[PDB]
Design a binder for this molecule. Structure first.
Ligand code: COA
Ligand code: COA
Ligand code: COA
Ligand code: COA
Lengths: 392, 394, 392, 394
């Protein structure tokens, strides 16, 4: 009952309708999974279970995790489940893998997440039994299943703005975090700090030569405080949340290979990282933006560690407001937060983001010579999940 | 040691466009969960995790398990995830609850599943970035995400007929198993053997009093071998699979309350059942109908145990052909299989069926004076899952 | 330059999603056309032109008039146009035929109208070039092309209520007209006064025996002033227009055979009726309910006839309010108006109604021993058309 | 006696999804109508009737002719009807105006047509009363109402290739006529021969200054026989019809002002042109491409006249194959046919094309010093319409 991470791989994150528009979510997951197995030196046929997150499942076909496992070359004989915990899906896949391995039921699991918000369909409610008369709506499945509360219909972006308002986080503080997120992502890319974690995506072409996507699409070298201050409130004209200080709709895949500490020892494998612990909390839907600091505090209490014991943090930038608020709630030095950039700059491919931030955290830790990291992520519907990892 | 089941409840199963047409999947889940908590005498605010299965998630809204949890009165502070393992979703929700409780991370979980195949939407692929010109498809999401192979586009019912053909199971054997399934379900309803497991669904009317649905809609009192032999093959003129020896599209929910052995003893709680063990196997998509007997064989191998120690079996009737094939492959006595009816009579609300068969198995064990049971279910994509349970009275 | 009517035939009028739900508009038009040719004793091959009205053309296929001509057994060699003047379509087809015959360019035209509001599709605007993101609408083509003003988006039923309000026509007066319209339609049917004009519709069956529709579906023997007074305002909670005092959405076909007076004389044909004259007026969209009395007054001025010279009137019951208002504006004895019932009782299959009221007027005239009739009809967009016919 | 044309105006023709993408059909109609009234020096409030053609009416809203009339500034008090005779709609609008004026019922009519094939919607058949289960079609309304036979479902382009095959018109003859069509259209634009007939379209931008579209978008300066020979057949691997020797889907409007001879003389108005005569014929749907030459022959027979008395012809290029076939059938000198280009180069906005070719014919006659012309157009469903006009200067 201890879980090691042998490997951690992610695709670049694409913009909505951008570089990965013609790649299915399951293909992005397959690419991440295959790169993780290569980097782990694990044969596909030795995988015992695949646990894969994706949120907008409508129209992906039967059990998307199986499609991603098969796209990776994992044989038919390996069992799989698809999991949905909205933004936490990719992280919960990993913490579920940790739990299953700690029972001894399995010793080698692939876990991660995938999303192609570019390829989400539109739906027709009412067409099955008939509209009869009067106009009806054609519903963006990203909006219906990902971006709006199932209880109130309110957009996540309205809840983000309401929390920023109640927490007293200014427009100017949010635009400063957005700027810093862009500058750290462009810097990390230029200086080669994403080279190790990224598996490029090759897109067969109508033309002759294949398109290679090797870089995160959304970071802007040319964004500035001045340009961000010009943008308009997107969800409410009185709020502070804009397109510039909120993450986009995005496409991406992320995968990790997990193994029992005991099996890795016996096989003579040097793990990339160890899972020390994880916890989740839940609050009302409208308070989802508050959860990452609560989840971090809950995990510190669980482990008996203090904030000063943590070398780096990845808090998913659900909004810039959420990185700032969660910094206050947990008393985090922002110099140790999202040091290679975060979702405001890099995007939020919902089902992948939870696994993506672990992949980024591991490599950020390796880059500063190892240490202890927490990845924390809030999720629509009002949950927060956090995991503590060690890179030796 | 062994995870305990305090309670197990299911809705009636409705026909497609039938008696539960106007009830959302998440409401069916909530009703089942609330009845499970009432029967367990567990407070909703003491639940630590809800793990709920559903397959056609398209258009249900954010994290359907959470909607089901809230519909049951479970507070905001309880964590939840939705799981999808096609037909196995409701069963894998339970075996995941078992693994989590066995780690010690939690001691009280609600697990189960739900589906409203009636309320699944249609989709438009291509409308987001534009058709430009030419006709396109408006796609039935039950067909796209539930009933067709992600790899080949082939209907599960084609795979059902192909496996029945290859195993040499006749049209006549399939129709006899279908007639038997209806006789056993009708018989279980009329003799009061479903009364304990079913939580009725109350549908508030715009008009007069509420409608209360208390009975499984699909079982037919008046079906016969004669009528079944008249039906035409549905997926291939040359195959043996009809609307009468294949389950329907259906609406339902089912829920169980799971607790650690240790916590159950501290609180004075007698288990309804114990989870002994579970396993899963996986094969090619086209071979999904063969998995239940293989899942049983691997589960027996794992527990050192013998087919003769098992008092009752629930094998989800993915087709009549699957109950027959699995009987030979596991060497099962048919008199010990699906004794109150199965999916051919009762229906297959995909996300719920894996929890549903465990609820039916627990109550069939209890009616028999107790014993050991295996629930086994195959799922689209080529998986089989089986769980071994123990039921004792007093 | 005079036009005779050799024959006049209509299908029964079906309710929305009712008796004619599985018959295409072009099939309803074909059935009417074929019955008119039989009743005229005119060979299909001698027809020189088919002019046919239909309003909701979306999804009917290429030139619906040609489909109706071919469904009637009219050979490929006969020319055809489809015309759209909303509610006036079926009447304008007839008055256009009169004009063409008065030039001598042709001497034998089939004219009429057809509508299947049951079979109108739904549309997606935005799907061609792509929604990109956000919910959109699926639009009822009856609502978009038939029932709402192209300028304001307002429902015809809102304009009906606004005119009833401005003209001081009470809820109670409208419910009395609705009751009278139902009682005259049921009476006409029971006493055989629709037997001559109706051509039954035969619907081939999944079962063995074909369904024969021989009766107008919408008239209610059991409707009463009491039941009508219980109904709620449908378009605005402060207005007087209800489901009971406004016509429905309906399905129907109507056809007439027109011939030059000179050719009919030479062939020894006794015409059913003669077209004496016609006129149209136009007003702003919102004033469409006012046009029938104006059109009648314009036609009396044109012919130098007075209201007392007219034996019977058919004013299409666009609303009960419109029969009442148009009665005042033209000073019409209501005992000579819509004597066998009208659209409030019988339905308003938009593209057919203009031809339908002429078919009804001719037979109502024959039943009282001949005389002079005016048919008048308002049409969405703010037009009114009226025709004066003689039955000798 | 003879109806007179005071004026004739057309928009540029836009490509599908091209330069007029953001302009509704009714706006294109209004722009053409307003330019016709300006050029006729006729007051909008003196018009007595608007007869306007459009084919894909689905989703345009109530009586599109009235929307076009109001877009032109024509008052509410002017009567209007929309007509549909597929590709002949714009031309039959004019010949109907001619018949009405010849009765004396009216003395001043606006006639013409419009289409925005760019803005045609998709439809859902079956969503009103419900799919129940199974995939359905989302239908391109251009395809359903414009481009396919109501009787067979066959694309007009299949009928085009079948008639080209049966008439023995080679791929090479079709591509030479296509190259010629582009050369003549490009040439007419560059040499200022379209400047008089075209009314530019001004598209107000959300952003900076308005976009002014003044040029036909489809004519290609850089097309060659070589490039045309490289294209693959569109509707049948074995046919000769390509994207290059068939017209596109296009956006456009065109309008004419018609007046009685008597009224024109009272008001001092010199006619742009006189309508001499018109006729229409009808054949089987599949034979629609053969009708233009037959319509010309019947119109000559009717007027006692001879093919040699006609100075210019506009035969709508429904396909290159149709211009060639019709040339043989009517015995036309190609040097007198479509002399400023036709639909293969210029496009086919179905509802407008029949008015458009009359506008182009009037200005080609005027450029030639005057004369007699015939416009002939075939239409989906199997019709042909031809109109004879006279143009004199001074
Ligand atoms: C906020 C949101 C509505 C924006 O959608 P969008 O309008 O498509 O966003 P875009 O990036 O296309 O548009 C924003 C505009 O601001 C500009 N902009 C955005 N970020 C900028 C930056 N950092 N610097 C400068 N300009 C910027 C863009 O260039 C664009 O302007 P343009 O139209 O001239 O190109 C969408 O990304 C969203 O809903 N995000 C939240 C996702 C979420 O909540 N996920 C979790 C769900 S549980
Ligand atoms: C088989 C299937 C296509 C049938 O759909 P359907 O046509 O809507 O089925 P119905 O329930 O309407 O039955 C069709 C006919 O058979 C008849 N029939 C069905 N079962 C019968 C029985 N036991 N006795 C007599 N008649 C019976 C019905 O009465 C009906 O007759 P009717 O149309 O005259 O009323 C559909 O249920 C299916 O695809 N099921 C497979 C489920 C599955 O594979 N799920 C797992 C995938 S991962
Ligand atoms: C008014 C309108 C919205 C009604 O649509 P609808 O709701 O489908 O109408 P229905 O007849 O189904 O419903 C009306 C209700 O009143 C009742 N009702 C209607 N007429 C009645 C009568 N004469 N006596 C008693 N009850 C009557 C019906 O039974 C029904 O009640 P129910 O739901 O219990 O069956 C629709 O017919 C309409 O828009 N009409 C105007 C058409 C028009 O303007 N055409 C010209 C366009 S240019
Ligand atoms: C023929 C038809 C299917 C073509 O549609 P499409 O594929 O959208 O056509 P495009 O304009 O995109 O042309 C296709 C290709 O041919 C090329 N092409 C077309 N005309 C060309 C020319 N003159 N020279 C060189 N290349 C040419 C285009 O550049 C394009 O190449 P690309 O795809 O690499 O850019 C369509 O226009 C049609 O159905 N037309 C018939 C109209 C009709 O029948 N109307 C009357 C019915 S009642």
């Amino acid at each position: 009952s201890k879980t090691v991470i042998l490997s951690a791989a992610r695709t670049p994150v694409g913009k909505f309708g951008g570089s990965l528009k013609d790649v299915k979510a399951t293909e992005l997951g397959g690419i991440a999974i295959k790169a993780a197995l290569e980097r782990a030196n694990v044969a596909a046929s030795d995988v015992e279970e695949v646990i894969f997150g994706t949120v907008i499942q409508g129209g992906q076909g039967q059990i998307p995790s199986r499609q991603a496992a098969r796209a990776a070359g994992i044989p038919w004989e390996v069992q799989t489940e698809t999991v949905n915990k909205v933004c936490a899906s990719g992280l919960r896949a990993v913490t579920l893998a940790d739990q299953i391995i700690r029972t001894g039921d399995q010793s080698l699991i692939v876990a991660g997440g995938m999303e192609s918000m570019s390829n989400s369909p539109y739906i027709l409610r009412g067409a099955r039994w008939g509209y009869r008369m009067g106009n009806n709506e054609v519903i963006d499945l990203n909006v219906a299943d990902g971006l709006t509360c199932a209880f109130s219909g309110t957009h996540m972006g309205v809840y983000g703005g309401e929390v920023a308002k109640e927490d007293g986080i200014s427009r100017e503080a949010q635009d400063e975090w957005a700027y810093r997120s862009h500058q750290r992502a462009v810097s990390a890319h230029k200086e080669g700090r994403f080279e190790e974690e990224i598996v490029p995506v090759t897109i067969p072409q109508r033309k002759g030569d294949p398109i290679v996507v090797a870089k995160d699409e959304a970071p802007r070298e040319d964004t500035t405080i001045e340009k961000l201050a010009k943008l308009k409130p997107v969800f409410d004209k009185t709020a502070t949340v804009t397109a510039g200080n909120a993450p986009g709709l995005n496409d991406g895949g992320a995968a990790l290979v997990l193994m029992s500490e005991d099996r890795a020892k016996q096989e003579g494998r040097k793990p990339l990282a160890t899972i020390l612990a994880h916890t989740a909390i839940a609050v009302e839907s409208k308070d989802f933006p508050r959860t990452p600091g609560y989840a971090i505090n809950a995990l510190l209490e669980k482990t008996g560690k203090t904030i000063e014991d943590i070398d780096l943090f990845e808090i998913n930038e659900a909004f810039a407001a959420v990185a700032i608020a969660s910094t206050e709630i947990a008393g985090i030095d922002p110099e140790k937060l999202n040091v290679n950039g975060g979702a405001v700059a890099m995007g939020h491919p919902i089902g992948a983001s939870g696994a993506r931030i672990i992949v980024t955290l591991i490599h950020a830790l390796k880059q500063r010579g190892g240490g202890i990291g927490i990845a924390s992520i809030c999720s629509g519907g009002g949950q927060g999940d956090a995991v503590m990892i060690e890179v030796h």
